[PDB]
Structure 1
Amino acid sequence: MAQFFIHRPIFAWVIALVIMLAGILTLTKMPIAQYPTIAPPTVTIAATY
């Protein structure tokens, strides 16, 4: 496999470029936060007498 690409450098360049292209496209629509969603659910009940 390494031997396979030693002779097809253009093919390896294409693989690298495709990877990079996918990630550049991914970043444009990626959400940015401070932390991931981490708070657990909380349900509160209220009643009056």
Structure 2
Amino acid sequence: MAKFFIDRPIFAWVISIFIIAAGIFGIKSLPVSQYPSVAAPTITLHAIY
């Protein structure tokens, strides 16, 4: 690991740019909320008599 990369910085830089691009794409496709979804579903039945 470290020995491999100490001799080729360009490989490590390329990996870093790929991670940066992935993170940017992740940011673009992330919704914005106040809190994480904690609401549970509810079903209500209405009857008349």
Q: Percent identity?
A: 55
Please name the residue that 1:24 is paired with: 24
Report the TM-score, using the length of structure 1 for normalisation.
Answer: 0.82
Number of residue pairs the alignment of both structures matches: 49
* Map of 1:5 onto structure 2: 5
TM-score (norm 2): 0.82
CA RMSD of aligned residues (A): 1.1
What amino acid is the match of 2:2?
A: A
Following superposition, the deviation at residue 46 of structure 1 comes to 1.8
Tell me how far apart the structure 2 counterparts of residues 16 and 38 of structure 1 sit (CA, whole Å). 34
Runs of 5+ consecutive residues of structure 1 not aligned to the other structure: none
Are 2:25 and 1:33 aligned? Answer: no
Residue of structure 2 equivalent to 1:15: 15
Runs of 4+ in 1 over 3 A off after TM superposition: none
In structure 2, runs of 5+ residues without a counterpart are none
The Cα of 1:32 is off from its aligned counterpart by 1.0
Helix, strand or coil at the partner of 1:38: coil
The offset of 1:48, in angstroms, is 2.3
